[PDB]
């Protein structure tokens, strides 16, 4: 540097340097697992968005409450329609052998009560056909314990797919590269 | 984007096993005797069987001594050492010229050494922790340090010196190193890409993640002469206090190499070659414009040729019955005293001929990627035969310039005569300077 | 195309020999241009915030570089804080 230059012991902290042209007239602030990185509201929002991603169209678009209740513990009213079920007795008219080969037992009745049971996984949770721990060893038997990242993150461009000349927005904090994308970022993303 | 300067038109002597030459090959035309002798000499050289051979050739300017030297240098390949330097470079300032001649002999002789080395490399995890067993405060001698790399992770602890090397590199947990275990120190690849992007900016390079398994092992083969070892040993390489920085900031000067250092380097190189580390090759020495040397060098070489390690040297004097520079009455052919010529033999490098010179000019046109007409080629060759080939050689390029400015790609008699008018030669200046009132 | 227009009288010197002087002249007569793909970050940096070295994020240093074309903020990687003020300057500097 400029040796023995002008300095009056004004700050000169190597990790503190705050200046501006005074449009706000303020100063600096003072006074590998995702489960230990961020809180739960945003991960819940991401899970809700992913469960919407499960929904394919108008058939499952309003099915989000059922999926949420499953996870947290004429379009969707079950596959029972007479235009589907009661008609199928003639849809196999090519050839079939539909015959009664069965005695009369409670299994035979369960063939029909469970047939159009109007029963879901939610009802399974609300029913005693399976015990309490079965749903736990169905749910918890899948999720991991602590391994959440062992290779780094990518942070791709939100709208385009650029890799260089990247930059974030002032207050939205969303990844982007092209300043052209900023024109719609400050309108629909920020 | 090319530059050819009186050469790059030569690529070899063009011989065979039976000593048969080729009339037009390798940029050489003619000189059957010279090519045969050069082939025999280079065949003797390739065997590494001898040391201190010498030869003098009698060749006038433009006869082809430098061309032969370059061809012979290329015969042995790039790896065989060579150092043909001007005869006026001996008279140095900071070191006595006989010491310089010894230094050049030391440089000329070659060698090939090798070494196998291992190295480890980001950092997976880190667990630091021996006993004083007495009145000492503590004893830290082992720390488990992670080693990510790419193809597998193998963390390992070593001597604590590697740990202080880790602090010396100032590497974080997500920082890649390159630690050659031969010394236990650190060579820094840089930061890592995995624990990177902690900020939008970083002057320090992110550095690509190391590729391959961490326990890297390799072998290196390097051909290094002995004078580099001497100069490396002469000056310090490390240090931390004022002496090291002041010495490195100080400018070293050329000095005199002591013979005890010669004995030491011979001993260590013998020890290393006996282990199979290094293989031996001699050198080749050439000096042009030798007749300007003084009698003291011309008589010291009498005993210097008896050095048992001195490689093959080639001696080149162009003059005739001349006295050695600084001799009152020691007049000899080519300016080399008889007591020195009693240690080597004589070759005769002679000038060229008519078809030979015209083919030389045509080939120079080819290497200069210019088209030459028969009439202009014959005029250039003829006036070279009367006076000098170099005149035509130095007129070729400006004649091509004239042709380009005429928007043509050939030399016509007009271009060569225009260059002749605009550019004279020595002969036309032998009869024009006398009638000059102003000097 | 820089040149070397120097008379041959001053070839003699008390610091460079004749061979060294001639070699220096010859090597100076032939030049090389070098193209380096350097980068930039231009724009009005209206503020330079330097946050503490938090353990989770080693530098939360805000600095709002923005040109006439766009408005943007950036972040310092615990290395460039003194780069701005090697000589004592303020924010808003291109
Ligand atoms: N026999 C030859 N065949 C082809 N080119 C030659 C031959 N002899 C000399 N030359 C060319 O002449 C040019 C000048 O030669 P020069 O080095 O002056 O010879 P000398 O060393 O005998 O003075 C060289 O660039 C070389 O390419
Ligand atoms: Zn984009
Ligand atoms: Zn935004």
Swiss-Prot record, chain A:
InterPro entries: Vps71/ZNHIT1, Znf_HIT. Its main location: nucleus. Zn(2+) 1 binds at residues 157, 160, 177, 181. The keyword Nucleus applies. It comes from Saccharomyces cerevisiae (strain ATCC 204508 / S288c) (Baker's yeast). Zn(2+) 2 binds at residues 169, 172, 185, 190. GO terms for cellular component: chromatin; nucleus; Swr1 complex. Keywords: Chromatin regulator, Metal-binding, Nucleus, Zinc, Zinc-finger. Belongs to the SWR1 complex at least composed of ACT1, ARP4, RVB1, RVB2, ARP6, YAF9, VPS71, VPS72, SWC3, SWC4, SWC5, SWR1 and HTZ1. The gene is VPS71. A zinc finger (HIT-type) spans 157-190. This is Vacuolar protein sorting-associated protein 71. One of its GO terms (biological process) is protein targeting to vacuole. Participates in the catalytic exchange of histone H2A for the H2A variant HZT1, an euchromatin-specific factor, leading to chromatin remodeling and changes in transcription of targeted genes. Indirectly involved in vacuolar protein sorting. It is found in: Nucleus. GO terms for molecular function: nucleosome binding; zinc ion binding. It comes from the Eukaryota. The keyword Cell division does not apply.
UniProtKB/Swiss-Prot annotation, chain B:
This is RuvB-like protein 1. PANTHER family: RUVB-RELATED REPTIN AND PONTIN. One of its GO terms (molecular function) is ATP binding. Present with 11600 molecules/cell in log phase SD medium. Its EC number is 3.6.4.12. It is found in: Nucleus. DNA helicase which participates in several chromatin remodeling complexes, including the SWR1 and the INO80 complexes. The SWR1 complex mediates the ATP-dependent exchange of histone H2A for the H2A variant HZT1 leading to transcriptional regulation of selected genes by chromatin remodeling. The INO80 complex remodels chromatin by shifting nucleosomes. Its ability to induce transcription of some phosphate-responsive genes is modulated by inositol polyphosphates. The INO80 complex is involved in DNA repair by associating to 'Ser-129' phosphorylated H2A histones as a response to DNA damage. Its main location: nucleus. InterPro entries: AAA+_ATPase, P-loop_NTPase, RuvB-like, RuvB-like_C, RuvBL1/2_DNA/RNA_bd_dom, TIP49_P-loop. Probably forms a homohexamer. Interacts with RVB2 and may form heterododecamers with RVB2. Component of the SWR1 chromatin remodeling complex composed of at least ACT1, ARP4, RVB1, RVB2, ARP6, YAF9, VPS71, VPS72, SWC3, SWC4, SWC5, SWC7 and SWR1, and perhaps BDF1. Component of the chromatin-remodeling INO80 complex, at least composed of ARP4, ARP5, ARP8, RVB1, RVB2, TAF14, NHP10, IES1, IES3, IES4, IES6, ACT1, IES2, IES5 and INO80. Component of the R2TP complex composed of at least RVB1, RVB2, TAH1 and PIH1. Interacts with SPT15/TBP and HSP90. Pfam families: TIP49, TIP49_C. ATP binds at residues 59-66. GO terms for biological process: box C/D snoRNP assembly; chromatin remodeling; DNA repair; protein stabilization; regulation of DNA-templated transcription; regulation of transcription by RNA polymerase II. Belongs to the RuvB family. The lineage of its organism: Eukaryota, Fungi, Dikarya, Ascomycota, Saccharomycotina.
UniProtKB/Swiss-Prot annotation, chain C:
Probably forms a homohexamer. Interacts with RVB1 and may form heterododecamers with RVB1. Component of the SWR1 chromatin remodeling complex composed of at least ACT1, ARP4, RVB1, RVB2, ARP6, YAF9, VPS71, VPS72, SWC3, SWC4, SWC5, SWC7 and SWR1, and perhaps BDF1. Component of the chromatin-remodeling INO80 complex, at least composed of ARP4, ARP5, ARP8, RVB1, RVB2, TAF14, NHP10, IES1, IES3, IES4, IES6, ACT1, IES2, IES5 and INO80. Also belongs to the R2TP complex composed of at least RVB1, RVB2, TAH1 and PIH1. Interacts with SPT15/TBP. This is RuvB-like protein 2. It is found in: Nucleus, Nucleoplasm. The gene is RVB2. The chain holds residues 96 to 189 of 471 of the full protein. DNA helicase which participates in several chromatin remodeling complexes, including the SWR1 and the INO80 complexes. The SWR1 complex mediates the ATP-dependent exchange of histone H2A for the H2A variant HZT1 leading to transcriptional regulation of selected genes by chromatin remodeling. The INO80 complex remodels chromatin by shifting nucleosomes. Its ability to induce transcription of some phosphate-responsive genes is modulated by inositol polyphosphates. The INO80 complex is involved in DNA repair by associating to 'Ser-129' phosphorylated H2A histones as a response to DNA damage. Present with 3030 molecules/cell in log phase SD medium. Belongs to the RuvB family. Disulfide bonds: none annotated.
């Amino acid at each position: 540097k400029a040796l023995v230059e002008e300095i009056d012991k004004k700050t000169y902290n190597p990790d503190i340097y705050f200046t501006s042209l005074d449009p706000q007239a303020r100063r600096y602030t003072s006074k590998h697992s995702f489960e230990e990185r961020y809180t739960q509201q945003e991960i819940l929002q991401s899970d809700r968005r992913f469960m919407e991603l499960n929904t394919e169209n108008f058939s499952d678009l309003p099915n989000v409450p059922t999926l949420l209740s499953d996870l947290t513990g004429y379009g969707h009213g079950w596959v029972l329609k007479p235009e589907t079920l009661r008609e199928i007795q003639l849809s196999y008219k090519s050839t079939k052998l539909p015959k009664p080969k069965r005695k009369n037992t409670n299994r035979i009745v369960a063939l029909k009560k469970v047939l159009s049971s109007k029963r879901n996984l939610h009802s399974f949770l609300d029913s005693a056909l399976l015990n309490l721990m079965d749903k736990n060893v169905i749910y918890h038997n899948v999720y991991n314990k602590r391994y959440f990242k062992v290779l780094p993150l990518i942070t791709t461009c939100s709208i385009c797919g650029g890799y260089d000349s990247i930059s974030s927005c002032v207050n939205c904090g969303n990844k982007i590269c092209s300043v052209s994308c900023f024109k719609l970022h400050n309108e629909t993303r920020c | 984007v090319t530059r050819t300067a009186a050469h790059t038109h030569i690529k070899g002597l063009g011989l065979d096993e039976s000593g048969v030459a080729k009339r037009v090959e390798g940029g050489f035309v003619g000189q059957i005797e010279a090519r045969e002798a050069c082939g025999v000499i280079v065949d003797l050289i390739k065997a590494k069987k001898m040391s201190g051979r010498a030869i003098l050739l009698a060749g006038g300017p433009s006869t082809g001594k430098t061309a032969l030297a370059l061809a012979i240098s290329q015969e042995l390949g790039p790896k065989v050492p060579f150092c043909p330097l001007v005869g006026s470079e001996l008279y140095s300032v900071e070191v006595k010229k006989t010491e310089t001649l010894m230094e050049n002999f030391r440089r000329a002789i070659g060698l090939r050494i090798k070494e196998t080395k291992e190295v480890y490399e980001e950092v997976t995890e880190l667990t630091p922790e021996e006993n004083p067993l007495g009145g000492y405060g503590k004893t830290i001698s082992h720390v488990i340090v992670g080693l990510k790399s790419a193809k597998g992770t193998k963390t390992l602890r070593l001597d604590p010196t590697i740990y202080e090397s880790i602090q010396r590199e100032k590497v974080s947990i997500g920082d890649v190193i390159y630690i050659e275990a031969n010394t236990g120190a650190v060579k820094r690849v840089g930061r890592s890409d995995a624990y990177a992007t902690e900020f939008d900016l970083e002057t320090e390079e992110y550095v690509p993640l190391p590729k391959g398994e961490v326990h890297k092992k390799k072998e290196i083969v390097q051909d290094v002469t002995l004078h580099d070892l001497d100069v490396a040993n002469a000056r310090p390489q490390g240090g931390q206090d004022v002496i090291s920085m002041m010495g490195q900031l100080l400018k070293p000067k050329k000095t005199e190499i002591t013979e005890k250092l010669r004995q030491e380097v011979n001993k260590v190189v013998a020890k290393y070659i006996d282990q199979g580390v290094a293989e031996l090759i001699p050198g080749v020495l050439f000096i042009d414009e030798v007749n300007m040397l003084d009698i003291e060098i011309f008589t010291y070489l009498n005993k210097a040729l008896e050095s048992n390690i001195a490689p093959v040297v080639v001696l080149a004097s162009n003059r005739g019955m001349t006295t050695v520079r600084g001799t009152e009455d020691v007049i000899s052919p080519h300016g080399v005293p008889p007591d020195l010529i009693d240690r080597l033999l004589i070759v005769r490098t002679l000038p060229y001929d008519k078809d030979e010179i015209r083919t030389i000019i045509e080939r120079r046109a080819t290497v200069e990627r210019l088209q030459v007409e028969s009439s202009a080629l014959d005029l250039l060759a003829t006036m070279g035969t009367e006076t000098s080939l170099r005149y035509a050689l130095q007129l070729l390029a400006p004649c091509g310039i004239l042709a380009q400015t005429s928007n043509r790609k050939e030399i016509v008699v007009n271009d060569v005569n225009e260059a002749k008018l605009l550019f004279l030669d020595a002969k036309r200046s032998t009869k024009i300077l006398e009638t000059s009132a102003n000097y | 195309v820089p040149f070397t227009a120097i008379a041959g009288s001053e070839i003699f010197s008390l610091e460079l020999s004749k061979t060294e002087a001639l070699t220096q002249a010859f090597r100076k007569s032939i030049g090389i241009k070098i193209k380096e793909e350097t980068e930039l970050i231009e724009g009005e940096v209206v503020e330079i915030q330097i946050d503490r070295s938090i353990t989770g994020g080693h530098k939360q240093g805000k600095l709002t570089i923005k040109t006439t074309d766009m408005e943007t903020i950036y972040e310092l990687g615990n290395k460039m804080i003194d780069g701005l003020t090697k000589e004592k300057v303020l924010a808003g500097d291109v």
